[PDB]
Short mmCIF file of C-alpha atoms and ligand atoms in Angstrom, two decimals:
data_model
loop_
_atom_site.label_atom_id
_atom_site.label_comp_id
_atom_site.label_asym_id
_atom_site.label_seq_id
_atom_site.Cartn_x
_atom_site.Cartn_y
_atom_site.Cartn_z
CA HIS A 1 -22.95 74.56 1.37
CA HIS A 2 -20.04 73.05 -0.26
CA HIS A 3 -16.98 72.91 2.01
CA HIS A 4 -14.05 70.77 3.10
CA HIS A 5 -12.51 69.59 6.38
CA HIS A 6 -8.83 69.97 6.63
CA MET A 7 -6.67 67.02 5.00
CA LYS A 8 -3.17 66.49 6.24
CA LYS A 9 -1.03 66.42 3.28
CA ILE A 10 2.31 64.64 3.29
CA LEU A 11 4.89 65.47 0.58
CA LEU A 12 7.28 63.02 -0.51
CA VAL A 13 10.80 64.64 -1.28
CA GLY A 14 13.98 63.02 -2.50
CA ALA A 15 16.23 62.04 -5.32
CA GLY A 16 15.23 60.12 -8.49
CA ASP A 17 16.54 56.85 -7.13
CA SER A 18 15.72 57.59 -3.41
CA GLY A 19 12.82 55.13 -3.57
CA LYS A 20 10.31 57.82 -2.73
CA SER A 21 8.07 56.61 -5.79
CA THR A 22 8.19 52.99 -4.43
CA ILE A 23 6.67 54.36 -1.30
CA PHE A 24 4.03 56.09 -3.17
CA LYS A 25 3.16 52.97 -5.25
CA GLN A 26 3.06 50.97 -2.28
CA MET A 27 0.71 53.45 -0.68
CA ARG A 28 -1.67 53.00 -3.60
CA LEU A 29 -1.71 49.23 -3.07
CA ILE A 30 -2.32 49.62 0.61
CA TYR A 31 -5.21 51.79 0.11
CA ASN A 32 -6.94 49.61 -2.72
CA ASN A 33 -5.83 52.16 -5.69
CA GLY A 34 -3.82 49.38 -7.58
CA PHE A 35 -2.96 49.44 -11.17
CA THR A 36 -5.46 49.29 -13.82
CA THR A 37 -5.18 47.33 -17.05
CA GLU A 38 -4.64 50.47 -18.84
CA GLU A 39 -1.75 51.59 -16.61
CA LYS A 40 -0.16 48.18 -17.02
CA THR A 41 -0.48 48.31 -20.78
CA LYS A 42 1.11 51.54 -20.81
CA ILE A 43 3.88 50.61 -18.43
CA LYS A 44 5.02 47.39 -20.33
CA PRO A 45 7.28 49.03 -22.85
CA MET A 46 8.91 50.85 -20.26
CA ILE A 47 9.71 47.70 -18.24
CA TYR A 48 11.09 46.27 -21.51
CA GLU A 49 13.14 49.17 -22.03
CA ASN A 50 14.40 49.09 -18.30
CA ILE A 51 15.36 45.47 -19.01
CA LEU A 52 17.26 46.28 -22.17
CA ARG A 53 19.27 49.32 -20.47
CA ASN A 54 20.34 47.29 -17.72
CA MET A 55 21.59 44.50 -19.89
CA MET A 56 23.33 47.09 -21.95
CA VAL A 57 25.08 48.59 -18.89
CA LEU A 58 26.21 45.26 -17.98
CA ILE A 59 27.70 44.76 -21.51
CA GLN A 60 29.45 48.05 -21.42
CA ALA A 61 30.71 47.12 -17.92
CA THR A 62 32.51 43.98 -19.08
CA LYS A 63 34.18 46.01 -21.57
CA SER A 64 35.38 48.44 -18.85
CA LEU A 65 36.45 45.53 -16.58
CA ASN A 66 38.35 43.93 -19.68
CA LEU A 67 36.23 40.70 -19.18
CA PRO A 68 36.07 38.92 -22.59
CA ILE A 69 32.63 37.27 -23.24
CA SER A 70 33.08 33.56 -23.30
CA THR A 71 31.68 32.78 -26.75
CA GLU A 72 31.36 34.28 -30.21
CA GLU A 73 27.77 33.46 -30.15
CA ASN A 74 27.10 35.63 -26.77
CA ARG A 75 29.63 38.35 -28.19
CA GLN A 76 27.45 38.69 -31.11
CA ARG A 77 24.20 38.70 -28.86
CA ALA A 78 25.75 41.38 -26.95
CA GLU A 79 26.49 43.55 -29.96
CA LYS A 80 22.90 43.11 -31.09
CA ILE A 81 21.67 44.30 -27.75
CA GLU A 82 24.06 47.22 -27.76
CA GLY A 83 22.52 48.33 -31.07
CA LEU A 84 19.01 47.94 -29.84
CA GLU A 85 19.68 49.90 -26.65
CA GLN A 86 21.37 52.60 -28.68
CA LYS A 87 18.33 52.91 -30.99
CA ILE A 88 15.54 53.11 -28.14
CA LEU A 89 15.30 56.95 -27.99
CA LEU A 90 15.69 57.34 -31.79
CA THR A 91 12.57 55.14 -32.86
CA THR A 92 9.14 54.53 -32.07
CA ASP A 93 9.07 50.81 -33.17
CA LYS A 94 8.41 48.15 -30.93
CA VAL A 95 12.00 46.48 -30.37
CA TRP A 96 10.95 44.02 -27.61
CA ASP A 97 10.06 40.55 -29.15
CA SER A 98 10.39 36.91 -28.00
CA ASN A 99 13.84 36.65 -29.93
CA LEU A 100 15.45 39.60 -27.83
CA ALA A 101 13.84 38.23 -24.47
CA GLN A 102 15.55 34.91 -25.13
CA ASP A 103 18.94 36.82 -26.15
CA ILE A 104 18.73 38.71 -22.80
CA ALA A 105 18.09 35.71 -20.87
CA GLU A 106 20.97 33.90 -22.32
CA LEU A 107 23.22 36.83 -22.03
CA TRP A 108 22.10 36.85 -18.08
CA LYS A 109 23.91 33.30 -17.99
CA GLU A 110 27.21 34.67 -19.26
CA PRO A 111 30.25 34.66 -16.85
CA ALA A 112 31.52 37.91 -17.84
CA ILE A 113 28.06 39.70 -17.37
CA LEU A 114 27.65 38.00 -13.94
CA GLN A 115 31.15 39.37 -12.88
CA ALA A 116 29.97 42.78 -13.77
CA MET A 117 26.88 42.17 -12.03
CA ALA A 118 28.83 41.41 -8.87
CA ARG A 119 30.54 44.73 -9.21
CA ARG A 120 27.13 46.36 -9.86
CA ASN A 121 27.55 49.19 -7.36
CA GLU A 122 30.26 50.44 -9.72
CA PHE A 123 27.79 50.86 -12.41
CA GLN A 124 24.50 52.53 -13.26
CA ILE A 125 22.35 49.75 -12.99
CA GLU A 126 18.85 49.73 -11.68
CA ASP A 127 18.01 48.13 -8.20
CA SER A 128 15.52 45.99 -9.61
CA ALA A 129 17.73 44.67 -12.64
CA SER A 130 18.25 41.21 -11.28
CA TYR A 131 14.39 40.94 -10.50
CA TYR A 132 13.61 41.39 -13.94
CA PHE A 133 16.18 39.35 -15.49
CA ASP A 134 15.47 36.47 -13.12
CA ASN A 135 11.76 36.67 -14.22
CA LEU A 136 12.12 36.64 -18.00
CA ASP A 137 10.41 33.39 -18.29
CA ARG A 138 7.19 35.31 -17.51
CA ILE A 139 8.13 38.83 -18.55
CA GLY A 140 9.41 37.48 -21.84
CA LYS A 141 6.00 35.93 -23.07
CA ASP A 142 4.11 37.04 -25.94
CA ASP A 143 1.03 37.40 -23.43
CA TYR A 144 2.92 39.41 -20.89
CA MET A 145 1.05 41.90 -18.87
CA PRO A 146 2.97 43.56 -15.96
CA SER A 147 2.33 42.24 -12.40
CA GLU A 148 1.71 44.34 -9.52
CA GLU A 149 5.20 43.65 -8.29
CA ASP A 150 6.66 44.42 -11.62
CA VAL A 151 5.06 48.05 -11.63
CA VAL A 152 6.11 48.79 -7.94
CA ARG A 153 9.80 47.82 -8.95
CA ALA A 154 9.91 50.04 -12.16
CA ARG A 155 11.43 53.50 -11.54
CA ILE A 156 9.07 55.71 -13.53
CA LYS A 157 9.96 59.49 -13.13
CA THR A 158 6.79 61.57 -11.79
CA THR A 159 6.15 64.45 -14.18
CA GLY A 160 2.74 65.74 -12.81
CA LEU A 161 0.75 65.41 -9.54
CA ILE A 162 -0.30 62.37 -7.96
CA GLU A 163 -2.03 61.99 -4.74
CA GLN A 164 -3.18 59.02 -2.38
CA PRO A 165 -5.73 60.20 -0.10
CA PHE A 166 -6.62 57.92 3.14
CA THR A 167 -8.18 58.14 6.43
CA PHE A 168 -6.10 57.25 9.67
CA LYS A 169 -7.48 57.39 13.09
CA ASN A 170 -10.78 58.81 11.77
CA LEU A 171 -8.89 61.81 10.16
CA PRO A 172 -8.28 62.45 6.40
CA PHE A 173 -4.68 62.56 5.15
CA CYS A 174 -3.05 62.16 1.67
CA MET A 175 0.51 61.27 0.38
CA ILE A 176 1.85 63.59 -2.51
CA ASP A 177 4.37 62.64 -5.14
CA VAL A 178 4.73 65.60 -7.46
CA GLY A 179 7.00 66.57 -10.54
CA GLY A 180 7.27 68.26 -13.91
CA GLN A 181 5.66 71.40 -14.81
CA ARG A 182 3.36 73.35 -12.55
CA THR A 183 0.04 71.33 -11.77
CA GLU A 184 -3.09 73.61 -11.68
CA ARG A 185 -4.81 73.98 -8.24
CA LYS A 186 -8.06 72.61 -9.34
CA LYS A 187 -6.43 69.02 -9.83
CA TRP A 188 -5.29 68.77 -6.24
CA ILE A 189 -7.90 67.26 -3.55
CA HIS A 190 -9.54 70.15 -1.88
CA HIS A 191 -7.87 72.25 -4.71
CA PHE A 192 -5.17 73.03 -1.97
CA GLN A 193 -1.51 72.75 -2.05
CA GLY A 194 -0.67 73.19 1.42
CA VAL A 195 1.86 70.66 3.17
CA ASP A 196 1.61 69.45 6.77
CA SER A 197 4.49 67.24 6.80
CA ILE A 198 7.42 66.25 4.59
CA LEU A 199 9.09 62.82 4.23
CA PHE A 200 12.58 63.43 3.00
CA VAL A 201 13.65 60.13 1.50
CA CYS A 202 17.17 59.08 1.19
CA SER A 203 18.65 55.87 0.10
CA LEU A 204 20.66 53.90 3.01
CA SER A 205 21.95 51.51 0.08
CA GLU A 206 23.73 54.10 -2.06
CA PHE A 207 26.91 54.39 0.13
CA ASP A 208 28.86 52.58 -2.37
CA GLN A 209 27.57 54.22 -5.63
CA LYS A 210 28.56 56.91 -7.86
CA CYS A 211 26.25 59.67 -8.91
CA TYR A 212 26.82 59.42 -12.81
CA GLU A 213 28.94 56.97 -15.03
CA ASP A 214 31.35 59.90 -15.96
CA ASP A 215 31.74 61.37 -12.48
CA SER A 216 33.55 60.21 -9.21
CA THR A 217 31.07 61.64 -6.85
CA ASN A 218 29.71 59.34 -4.22
CA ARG A 219 25.97 59.28 -3.97
CA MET A 220 25.50 59.17 -0.22
CA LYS A 221 28.01 62.00 0.13
CA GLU A 222 25.98 64.21 -2.31
CA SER A 223 22.79 63.19 -0.62
CA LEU A 224 24.32 64.31 2.84
CA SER A 225 25.28 67.66 1.23
CA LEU A 226 21.79 68.27 -0.34
CA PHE A 227 20.14 67.33 2.80
CA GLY A 228 22.09 69.67 4.69
CA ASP A 229 21.30 72.51 2.26
CA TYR A 230 17.65 71.68 2.35
CA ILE A 231 17.05 71.17 6.15
CA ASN A 232 18.99 74.39 7.03
CA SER A 233 17.59 76.80 4.35
CA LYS A 234 13.78 76.17 4.00
CA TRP A 235 11.29 78.05 5.67
CA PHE A 236 8.99 74.98 6.77
CA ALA A 237 6.49 77.39 8.18
CA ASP A 238 4.12 74.73 10.16
CA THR A 239 5.37 71.82 8.14
CA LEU A 240 6.87 68.85 10.34
CA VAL A 241 9.92 67.15 8.45
CA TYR A 242 10.82 63.36 8.69
CA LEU A 243 13.88 61.70 7.51
CA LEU A 244 13.30 58.30 5.89
CA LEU A 245 16.36 56.27 5.33
CA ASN A 246 15.08 53.80 2.69
CA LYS A 247 16.22 50.66 1.01
CA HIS A 248 17.27 49.41 4.56
CA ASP A 249 17.13 45.54 3.63
CA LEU A 250 19.27 46.14 0.31
CA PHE A 251 21.87 48.06 2.61
CA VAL A 252 21.87 45.15 4.94
CA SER A 253 22.50 42.79 2.13
CA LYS A 254 25.32 44.87 0.94
CA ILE A 255 27.13 45.22 4.29
CA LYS A 256 26.54 41.43 4.87
CA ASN A 257 28.21 40.64 1.44
CA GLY A 258 31.21 42.50 2.02
CA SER A 259 30.88 46.10 0.59
CA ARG A 260 32.50 48.00 3.36
CA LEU A 261 31.06 51.43 4.58
CA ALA A 262 34.78 52.47 5.60
CA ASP A 263 35.69 52.40 1.93
CA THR A 264 33.50 55.43 1.39
CA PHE A 265 33.47 56.97 4.86
CA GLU A 266 37.14 56.78 6.46
CA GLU A 267 35.44 58.00 9.69
CA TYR A 268 33.44 54.89 10.29
CA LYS A 269 35.19 52.90 12.92
CA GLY A 270 32.63 50.29 13.66
CA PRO A 271 32.76 46.55 13.18
CA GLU A 272 33.09 44.96 9.79
CA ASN A 273 29.95 43.25 8.27
CA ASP A 274 27.71 44.88 10.94
CA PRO A 275 24.73 46.47 9.42
CA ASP A 276 23.32 47.97 12.81
CA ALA A 277 26.65 49.95 13.44
CA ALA A 278 27.02 51.10 9.97
CA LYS A 279 23.40 52.29 9.68
CA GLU A 280 23.64 54.01 12.93
CA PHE A 281 26.70 55.80 11.94
CA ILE A 282 24.90 56.86 8.57
CA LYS A 283 21.99 58.12 10.70
CA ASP A 284 24.38 59.97 12.88
CA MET A 285 25.91 61.72 9.81
CA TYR A 286 22.44 62.92 8.72
CA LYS A 287 21.55 64.22 12.16
CA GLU A 288 24.67 65.99 12.24
CA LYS A 289 23.64 68.01 9.03
CA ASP A 290 20.62 69.10 10.91
CA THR A 291 22.24 71.72 12.96
CA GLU A 292 19.07 73.24 14.47
CA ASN A 293 17.51 69.86 15.04
CA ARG A 294 14.68 70.66 12.60
CA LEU A 295 13.89 66.94 11.99
CA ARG A 296 10.77 65.75 13.93
CA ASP A 297 12.15 62.27 13.70
CA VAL A 298 14.24 59.50 11.58
CA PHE A 299 13.05 56.21 10.52
CA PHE A 300 14.71 53.35 8.71
CA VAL A 301 12.50 51.62 6.14
CA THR A 302 12.29 49.21 3.39
CA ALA A 303 9.54 50.43 0.82
CA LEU A 304 9.72 47.34 -1.17
CA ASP A 305 8.51 45.60 1.87
CA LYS A 306 4.77 46.49 2.22
CA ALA A 307 4.35 45.32 5.72
CA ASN A 308 7.38 47.26 7.12
CA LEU A 309 6.28 50.42 5.07
CA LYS A 310 2.92 50.19 6.52
CA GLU A 311 4.28 50.01 10.05
CA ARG A 312 6.77 52.92 9.61
CA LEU A 313 4.05 54.95 7.90
CA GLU A 314 1.64 54.23 11.00
CA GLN A 315 4.37 55.63 13.29
CA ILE A 316 4.71 58.64 11.17
CA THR A 317 0.92 59.44 10.87
CA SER A 318 0.37 58.74 14.55
CA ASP A 319 3.34 61.12 15.52
CA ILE A 320 1.92 63.82 13.21
CA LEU A 321 -1.36 63.67 14.96
CA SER A 322 0.33 63.86 18.27
CA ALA A 323 1.82 67.24 17.12
CA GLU A 324 -1.38 68.73 16.08
CA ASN A 325 -2.44 70.06 19.29
CA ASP A 326 1.07 71.32 20.26
CA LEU A 327 0.93 74.55 22.13
NA1 NA B 1 -18.69 68.95 6.97
NA1 NA B 2 -13.88 72.85 -3.04
#
């Protein structure tokens, strides 16, 4: 008769800018489940709105920093972009055209904008902002269709259930990213919602960022607090929990470029411009929150590096399998 064989489901858990959605999208690519023409068509205006919002944030940042724009032409261009961004949630019109793409590319050369961008950790700017700005020659074309990498880098909030099944060492698995309202059980693979493992994803690179524009709370301090609450309160039943410290390579660049961990965490006494000492301190802070040692393991990862993510996920799935027969 109709029947199933147990699939080991791995649930992605994390904040909205943890990069957990990057992990899921990379898994889609690893398992030949890439983005269709319809998907790319639908995501295209969202990429436009991402780019417009990032430039708006930079314009506002020059005002906060008291940095005058170099020319009246770029000042009027900035005012135009401000007006269009402020209209985005209040219209159904297509705001993006070739004129706007050219205006944003010109503003990306403005010294006041670039000074704000050098201080981007202080502002609410997407990680992918410079990527999109630097590729505006391609993205601003009338014939533009988002690339694979464009989609991976676009932070789109999950509002339903998505699953990526796969086979590893001849056994079935799937990775889950789920949000929004309750998704009916019939939509799940095997119409089954049980979770064998949790990947708790935290950003390593957020140590020098604020939670919101109008709040002083540090993102990493908040994530440590939330992780502490989660790992000590959940009944995990039979579920294995892994901590993934993501955006590792971005963290490394921040440390190498002079953003000091000690400016956020005064207890960090390690060397300056030393990413390995700094990331070990962060890993230790997370493990300290895990009072009863409920974590199975802790991994550093850069989800945007598909080869690195593959390697770390293979380590995780191998370890899940090794624990299956634990007595
Ligand atoms: Na069977
Ligand atoms: Na069934």
